[PDB]
Symmetry: D2
Subunit: 482 residues, 4 copies
């Protein structure tokens, strides 16, 4: 299993990356990137913890002990082992704040494994290139070298004004093929953790009128010549004492510029078929969406805890008004958790025999989180009061003359004044900080319930009078069904 | 297995029942009560349906074919057989509108079976009376006679007069104990289906300061001398053509008066111990609470169906704003269902080996429905538009001169004019009649479903910082957990 | 000023009215309709009350004393006198439950008075019919004869049936034209109080591709031969003691069928011009929309009062969790009231010199009621608890042997046990009867979601970046605007 | 009228203030503070602009031209002139983001002016002192020297420890009564802009069982010996090109500690009486609450604008689902504005002849904002998409090789790619930074808006059944009203 130290070294590979105005010499070391880079290191080192060997690792089919990240769930029971693996990672690293650690996006490659043939036999202009072997090859490399391969699938909003038939810029497209590979030019909008990966997982989602020279699926090293990762600015805090979570690292998002970059045939999985990009890219995001639900449920759990802690510390916890508000937080958690459990119980098997959770249920589970996060945030903030705003710094607390005033301001029915600040600082980082803010934003444009969901229900499912919801009502109304 | 015929006959036993201003001579026959009575009769006859023998009946341990209402789930799979039993009943009778058919409240008696001794052992003032044997005797009678025994547990609201503690409350209490039994005087409030039972299941839920003599658990014949069942006025409709659901029967709710009622020792399960009334009465309500959720999930399913039907018939189903609203109804059902399924997967076993669903989850599931049901039905009413209001009556539709106008008014893309009226009539019955409005109040007649459920749970498990919710937040805040 | 007796007698004119399957011989005396009929009578008699002379009547410009329903406001103060007139009617008649009493819809005719000629000169196919004198004549008749003229504007639902081009719709249309007048055939849908008017106010609203032959504005007697008023079934209760409100009358809604009805030229205001129906029919609903808001603010006030009465009678009013819930109701009333007041302070004058309230503000006020009334219903019901459901009849309350149990059950800190039943009966009528339910549907139809509220705003106002909301944002963003 | 320069120089007076760990040598010049200080300076310079003399200044009673912040409204029209003054300030300075510029809290001193004597006559422990003259003295000083005097009323949370809420509080209390003044020791919990005022307005709000020794009202210089202003860490951004709003200054919040400071008698307004602290501190906060509402209506206006702009630039504005959402935003602003209008129309006069707005209405107005602010934020962000996240810094946009790609990326149906970035940056600052998050918290921190607002309301208005809401419901229920 890869080591954190090894991960950090592999970052200094001459990849060209900007964080805002600032060009980055070495992601592992630069003040704007090093902290998150060290979280990914932390991710790898976690798997060497003797006490975590059972939850984090398994003996693979080749006799090699690996991260359960690579393990395939065969049934619901298997899926709970997988979930427990993911939850252990999240609980350990920054209060489950990071959504694109390696286990999150790496598992998406299993959709290829489920049926590698289709990706080659459905390519347009793939001639006699062995794309199927390209899949098998990378899956082995990915797994055995324990690589980190972030997703780069999102396209620009694509000009909603011009003649769509003339699709020039800014989308990434094949501008020429040769005997050695293809050349691509354009950009990938919104990619998370691109600067911190070994390879990037280039792909796309179907949209009506998608050219075909734009249907590209590949995995290329991050430092492939002609690639520039332009990151938004980093929101990491420099004072760990004042910001226990925000100072731990910003999971950067970026737009990736491909400047006529050459992609060897060996690194391509599929090209050219808009029809194939319909539904197959969709499956690629299944495990990502499932992982998000896991993260969401843990977050709901954290908020309940924070609410119970801050509220017991101040001594308002036994007020009917307060407890009723805590009840809403518990409700929210139980609602999130129920979508998670129900989805895991109503799953199915992929071609590769992998047991997949029910997408209808976990996708609505995600919609439920997005639609109510504002509500619960407001409740936590209301319960915390000034504890998330008027936080005395260490210098003020430790002051000889006035330090004792702060101790008195924060003392409660359970003593331990320090705890008020500790709790308040977590709530602040989470909800009153740039860093905490991007944690809405992340899962936000990713969905938009009303919008996406019903464009994402009648896609694999049937929400018509002839579907499952039509039976009972029809019978009750005395109308024939079927 | 009892027939509806036998059931109907058992109603004419001299029970004293008021419906509004009138004393009812025969509940089975009276215009105000006969319809619901025939719904219970229908419940019984259903089990004799040759094609329903598998879902509805089983062979008991004594080699007797009985209703599956008497069957014990011993694992999750068995629980789903139980639920399928209940759902078959629900879908078949008045669109799952009735909440206290015999299978809903009869199974709560297994709570006694799980551990009969404790009810006697914990009694105060009932020594030498064989309460344990009383339990076994009634369980046997209830089952073998196939009796219907509604719960009568709900107490009068507390009188908040400053001087309340210096006079009698209206609550039911033991007023005398004798060699033959106990004399009982007072009121049980908001009882559902009392007038239609063979026996009533007398009991109480704990409240701070509840006196020993008010703690009574027993089952007595509905027609016990001194018992008067005061029902609310009946909202049953007379025209089945215009009212397909509301004409099928009104599940009456009652205030039961006990005028110095004599109860033989043989009908008594427990008396005198407030401490016992803490956890145990909650166990009795578990199974009925779980049944309510089953019914609530079907109702959510019905609502989505009606929305899809009426929305497709009018031709508004295609509009994106309309699709989004139908989707959020799908969301509601999915959330209800998720609670149901999650509670079934995380259940536990009683001392009697019976597999119970998770009360934390299904009870918060109930609270989710109760808090949202009005908002949800408003969406349905809004989507149906004028079709739930401007409904042509049969005579207007059949009118030789003007009927054709109504056919045109109700014609849409689907091209079946009659259907719009069929759907309009069930929506109207469900949410625009007094019969329909009853469904909002009879299970939510106290203050705040969410908090009520939350307060009940923290008397059953730890919702404090020392409980399961404090662990993750404590860790994150650097606070010790134990 | 017309008397109630005069109104009642005018109803007996051989008009053809169905209520459900029942043909009505006289709307004034029939069991299904007499009660609402008597509410309109009450409306008239109210104006003869000496003590009410000031708020209800004024001396007209001809020196005759008439109801202030005919009085014109010329400024903000004048609008207040008008509203005070409306509110006094509403408060007097059935808790403000009726929304189409004569003063509500009669005043819409002043739309014609603001500019009568335009209706003439914009007509197509009415050359030489002096529709202007027609207008002036009816306006005088309307007022001096003190008639009641309900609106009949609404059209059958836009359905794309099998062939909405090969076959004709149910819409009212000009079928033939003569030297005497016009012949119309078709239907007006969802009219309110039609069966109770002396005349009906025929009109239409614009709709993409509406035929000129369907554009018709007129006022004809209700008993005009060939006219049939088909009412939905009546929901009025037969027992005033148990239903203090729902027994007072049902403001019926109807479908009006015109079987080749002849309208004399002298009863026509405009025909034939789709362009005219684009802006003027909306002006007609302006005053009714304003009256709707007034009724809504009142209803919010009623609801607050009910919550305060029931919570005080029970004794929970001082509980912090109850105070907070009641605050929500007060918040809703104040929000409704704020829109009301703000619209009156920011109005404008019509050509007729009449001061109109701000439509943007009072229409959004209306939308606020529609979007929050379920939440308000829910909040009141939750506070009232069992009192709105478990209501003892007079017979039960007065029973000699068991009646005293109900006194004890309903006793509280403020004594007067009977009051709890009184309050509960009002709440039950308002929210848990057929009659109460239609007071939801009154507006539960007049606009698909918001597919017609910003398409009815952005296109009827600026509501663009160049509009009034674009100024501040543009500045702050350092952009354009100008 | 004071000058920005003059104000800046007044700051360097040896006041001891910390921003986090940093002791501040000069509030006017320090990097953590100078930006907000220059905003207060901007506030003063605004008054000297010739183009704004009309709206910002007036000739006072003494003949001297002054800022309209010192002007008294004597009627509704006058109040509107005052509102136009405040809004002009807000719209000019950082998009109305600052809530405690001098005009916001300075006007609260008019409370004293309304009735000066009562503050002395009600004092306890100051027998023989003339305090009334002090009010007139400071009032003159305040106005003529054009001083800035922030509020400092909020006390430490009354922790239910035992001896923390008993005597040994951090609460500011009178420890010593000299014949030259008093000596005070303790803490003022939360204070906004204290470190930026010439004086601080010391005061307190009543709470059950508050000592008379903690009831102190006064105005002392900020650089008084023994006073330390401890500020939370500052959230000011460094780069105005990336942060157009957040770089403009952080309106800091403080805990002020009084280590045995001596207040001269000529600065005391009242001491010793808890009964006085009941209603009079409420009147102090009246004008502040009104100003907050003015500010909240502007922000709601701003939010609508941003939503329109971004939605139009992306070309998503025509979508029915989107325009529906924008209409909700317009509804929020309309609702907020209506509370504002209505409060101004239903005000009253103070003893001093000042026309004050209606507090019941503008306080429920504030509550409406506090409750909905989170949801409307979410809608803005969801509408903006990646624009508020994936923002190309200046350097990336200007880049010679790649810049072009960002231009094509932000191109929309309306061109002007740069605008997407400009709007996006404004939104990010508002809701995705800590500077922004402070704004939706600093508002409410005391408890629950709707409840507390209503709790404070029951004190000013009669909200019982004997109150104004009891009338209508009582008549409807047949209950006597008095």
């Amino acid at each position: 299993m890869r080591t954190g130290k090894q991960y950090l070294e592999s970052l200094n590979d001459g990849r060209v990356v900007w964080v805002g105005n600032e060009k980055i010499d070495n992601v592992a070391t630069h003040p704007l990137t090093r902290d998150y880079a060290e979280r990914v290191a932390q991710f790898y080192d976690l798997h060497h913890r003797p006490d975590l060997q059972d939850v984090l690792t398994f003996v693979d089919a080749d006799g090699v002990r690996r991260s359960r990240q690579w393990q395939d769930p065969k049934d619901a029971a298997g899926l709970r082992v997988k979930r427990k693996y993911h939850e252990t990672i999240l609980r350990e690293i920054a209060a489950g704040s990071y959504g694109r650690l390696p286990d999150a996006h790496n598992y998406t490659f299993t959709t290829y494994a489920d049926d590698p043939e289709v990706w080659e036999k459905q390519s347009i202009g793939a001639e006699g290139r062995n794309l199927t072997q390209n899949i098998h090859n990378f899956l082995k490399l990915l797994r055995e070298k324990d690589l980190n391969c972030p997703l780069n699938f999102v396209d620009p909003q694509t000009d909603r004004s011009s003649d769509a038939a003339q699709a020039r810029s800014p989308n990434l497209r094949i501008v020429e093929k040769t005997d050695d590979g293809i050349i691509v030019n354009g950009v990938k909008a919104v990619g998370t953790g691109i600067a911190f990966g070994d390879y990037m997982h280039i792909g796309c989602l179907y949209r009506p009128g998608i050219p075909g020279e734009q249907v590209i699926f590949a995995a290329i090293p991050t430092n492939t010549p002609g690639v520039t990762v332009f990151c938004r600015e980093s929101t990491v805090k420099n004072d760990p004492a004042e910001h226990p979570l925000a100072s731990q690292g910003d999971e950067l998002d970026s737009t990736t510029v491909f400047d006529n970059v050459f992609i060897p045939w060996e690194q391509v999985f599929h090209i050219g078929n808009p029809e194939h990009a319909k539904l197959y890219p969709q499956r690629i995001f299944d495990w990502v969406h499932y992982h998000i639900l896991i993260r969401q449920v843990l977050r709901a759990e954290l908020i309940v805890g924070l609410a119970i802690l801050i509220t017991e510390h101040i001594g308002t916890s036994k007020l009917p008004t307060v407890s009723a508000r805590v009840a809403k937080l518990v409700a929210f958690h139980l609602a999130m958790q129920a979508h998670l459990i129900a989805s895991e119980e109503t799953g199915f098997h992929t071609k590769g025999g992998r047991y997949k959770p029910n997408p209808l249920i976990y996708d609505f589970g995600r919609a439920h989180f997005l639609q109510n996060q504002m509500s619960v945030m407001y409740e936590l903030l209301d319960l915390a009061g000034r504890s998330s705003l008027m936080i005395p710094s260490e210098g003020q607390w430790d002051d000889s003359q006035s330090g004792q005033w702060f101790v008195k301001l924060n003392n409660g029915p359970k003593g331990n004044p320090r705890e008020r600040v500790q709790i308040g600082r977590v709530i602040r980082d989470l909800y009153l900080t740039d860093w905490g803010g991007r944690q809405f934003m992340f899962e936000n444009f990713n969905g938009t319930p009303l919008f996406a969901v019903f464009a994402a229900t009648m896609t694999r499912d049937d929400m018509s009078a002839a579907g499952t919801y039509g039976k009972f009502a029809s019978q009750v109304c005395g109308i024939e069904f079927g």
